[PDB]
Every structure is written in C-alpha cells, then in structure tokens.
Design an enzyme around this catalytic site. Structure first.
Site, PDB file in Angstrom:
ATOM      1  N   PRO A   1       0.845  -1.196   0.000  1.00  0.00           N
ATOM      2  CG  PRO A   1      -0.532  -1.425   1.886  1.00  0.00           C
ATOM      3  CD  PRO A   1       0.273  -2.214   0.912  1.00  0.00           C
ATOM      4  CD  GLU A   2       1.657   3.263  -4.327  1.00  0.00           C
ATOM      5  OE1 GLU A   2       2.096   4.425  -4.624  1.00  0.00           O
ATOM      6  OE2 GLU A   2       1.556   2.313  -5.165  1.00  0.00           O
ATOM      7  CE  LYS A  53       5.320   2.968   0.074  1.00  0.00           C
ATOM      8  NZ  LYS A  53       6.100   2.088  -0.812  1.00  0.00           N
ATOM      9  CG  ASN A 175       4.975  -0.256  -9.038  1.00  0.00           C
ATOM     10  OD1 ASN A 175       5.976   0.324  -9.472  1.00  0.00           O
ATOM     11  ND2 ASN A 175       4.364  -1.235  -9.715  1.00  0.00           N
TER      12      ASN A 175
END
Length: 286
Positions: A1-2, A53, A175
C-alpha cells in the site's frame, strides 16, 4: 500500500473510535506470527496517526481504568491485504489477526486488523521504522530537505523510478504513485536520479510573488511527491472503513493517467517491479 491509504485508514480509525471505549485485552489470532500485545485495561481509547506507509495506534487507558496500564503504541505495515475494520462483535472477519473489543455501554463492536495474506506486520512500541524518511504527505518541508541535503548518497546514482521507491527518501511513495508522478513531468523513468534533482539543490529566498510567477505553473518533482498523493487523499473522502468501496475504486481508477493504462509502456526495474511510463525510457533502462 501507499501513503494515501495509510493516511485515510488513520483518519477512519480516529474518527470511528473517538467516542468508543475499549476494554479487556488485545487478542491475536493463534496463527499470526506477529507478537502478542501485552495490554489489559477496563477502559481505553484508541487513536491513530500515519507516516508514510506506516500506521501507529495508541491505546490510552481512561481515568480510573484498571489494572494499571501505561499507554501503548503499536505500528503497523499493512502489506497487500491488511486493513482495519470496525465490525459487530458477532461478525468478526475470518482473517482478523488482531482485535480490540468495546466495553459497554453501547453496541458490542470489535476493531480488527484484517489480513488474509498475512503480509502485514506490527511491532510493539511507537517507533517508526529506522531510517524511513519524513512522510511525503505530512512532513513535506522535512521530506524535501532530507532529499536535497543527501543528494550525494548512492541512492541517487540509481534510475529515478527506483530512487522514488527508496523509503529512506520517499516514505509513502509506491508503484502507482511513482508512475503517476513521473508521468506528470514526463521524466523518463530511467534517467539518473541525481540528474533529475540536481537543479533543485542547495522558502523566503523567493517571495510569494516570484514563486507565483515562476514556480506555480512549473511544479518540481519533489513538489509532486507531496501534491499527487494529496490528490488521492482528497479523492478518498471518508470512504475508508465504510460500505463505499465500489464507488471509491471507480473514482481511483478514473484518476490514474499512467499506471496500467492503455498505450503506456512498461518495463521491469532492478527489483522486478513494473514501472509504467509514456515515451522515452531513459538511459539507464534495462
């Protein structure tokens, strides 16, 4: 996750929990390989914050609670399938690996860390991961300064798309965000990171008028590392933890301009992570 998700998850926890009182022990599933949480209180409040994060819970006994218990912080990294859920006590999800139960009065609820794949992690204590840099969302000025002061580091010898994933310098960027951010500036993903950033290095150097004239329509890469995830946050509203996930992901899907999109190019970086981009891959491309 970001980073946007961690932030939105913290918001959910804090607001859902603001008036709830938890009681008892913190329960871990037998199967979880994470640590048991030694903690017991008849009446405690749960609060949250995020940094990059990671998400930090604080468990804070209320006045008169027994037994004696210090506040306790716990820092989570979600992994691919981790989430927080607030559920009725008789409806505990199957893969609820860490659970906090409300005390009466009011409905019997459980705050659960849920994680089918079991890639999520927690540790005892409030500490953020060693070496993770300032949050791109919550600590912008320190984030920027930590990059610019440290541009001589070997991390910046790498291609910019790989440097953007180094959490010592870009804590919160993953990403999808690296794709989206590089796409806004059409920076090739395999330009050398320091070559992209050099011109920014050595506030109230330029006045607001001068910044409006020259910087407003020309945001730099470090500016976008903050503002692009802020877009996702705004877009997310207060949907986390509610029943709006179908609408929320349709809105996210519509927001993306580059990641996974038709017509875009893709390459694998040195870690086998797929970078999406338009146009020239840059000089350091595999």
């Amino acid at each position: 996750p970001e980073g946007p998700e961690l932030h939105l998850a913290s918001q959910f926890v804090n607001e859902a929990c603001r008036a709830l009182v938890f009681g008892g022990c913190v329960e871990k599933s037998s199967v979880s390989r994470n640590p048991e949480v030694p903690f017991e209180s008849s009446a405690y409040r749960i609060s949250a914050s995020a940094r990059g994060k990671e998400l930090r819970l604080i468990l804070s006994p209320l006045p008169g609670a027994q037994p004696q218990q210090e506040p306790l912080a716990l820092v989570f990294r979600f992994g691919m399938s981790g989430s927080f859920q607030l559920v009725p006590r008789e409806e505990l999800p199957r893969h609820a690996h860490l659970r906090f139960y409300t005390a009466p009065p009011g409905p019997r609820l459980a705050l659960c860390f849920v994680d089918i794949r079991r890639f999520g992690r927690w540790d005892l204590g409030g500490k953020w991961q060693p070496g993770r840099g300032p949050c791109v969302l919550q600590e912008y000025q320190q984030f920027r300064e930590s990059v610019l002061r440290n541009l001589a580091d070997k991390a910046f010898d790498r291609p910019i798309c790989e440097a953007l994933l180094d959490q010592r310098f870009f804590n919160g960027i993953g990403n999808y965000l690296r794709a989206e951010i590089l796409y806004r500036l059409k920076i090739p993903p395999f330009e050398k990171a320091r070559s992209v950033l050099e011109a920014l290095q050595q506030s109230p150097e330029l006045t607001l008028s001068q910044k409006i004239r020259t910087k407003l329509q020309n945001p730099d890469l470090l500016e976008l590392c903050h503002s692009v995830p802020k877009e996702v946050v705004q877009l997310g509203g207060r949907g986390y933890g509610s029943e709006s996930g179908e609408e929320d992901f349709a809105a996210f899907r519509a927001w993306l301009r580059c990641y996974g999109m038709p017509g875009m190019s893709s390459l694998q970086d040195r870690h086998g992570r797929t970078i999406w981009f338009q146009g020239d891959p840059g000089p350091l491309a595999p």
